[PDB]
Design a protein around this motif. Structure first.
Motif: not given
Lengths: 49, 49
Positions: B5, B8, B11-12
């Motif tokens: 995770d 991301t 990414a997020d």
């Protein structure tokens, strides 16, 4: 700043003119009260003469 | 599924920063409208006075 200069310096002029407009019409009256000496201190026409 | 995770987590959060970049929009107009209001309150309040 504008509220200062646009009024305080303007009253350098208006403060003067406030006296002028009355002062001119004062003299247009002053020529009268002291002009009137020609009658008011000439009772000779009706008394002393 | 646990051990990734982190990929991301990157990414997020970039998308979160892109919300801050889109946040230029409201802060621009909020700045512009109140700037205009300040100038209109100036020239108005000054020319009136």
């Amino acid at each position: 700043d504008a509220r200062e200069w646009g009024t305080n310096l303007i009253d350098k002029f208006t403060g003067g003119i406030r006296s002028k407009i009355s002062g001119l019409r004062n003299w247009l009256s002053e020529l009268r009260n002291i002009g009137a000496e020609v009658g008011i201190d000439v009772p000779t026409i009706g008394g002393g003469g | 599924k646990k051990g990734w995770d982190i990929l991301t987590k990157s990414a997020d959060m970039f998308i979160n920063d892109l919300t801050s970049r889109i946040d230029s929009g409201v802060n621009d107009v909020r700045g512009f409208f109140t700037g205009l209001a300040s100038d209109l309150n100036e020239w108005g309040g000054n020319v009136a006075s």
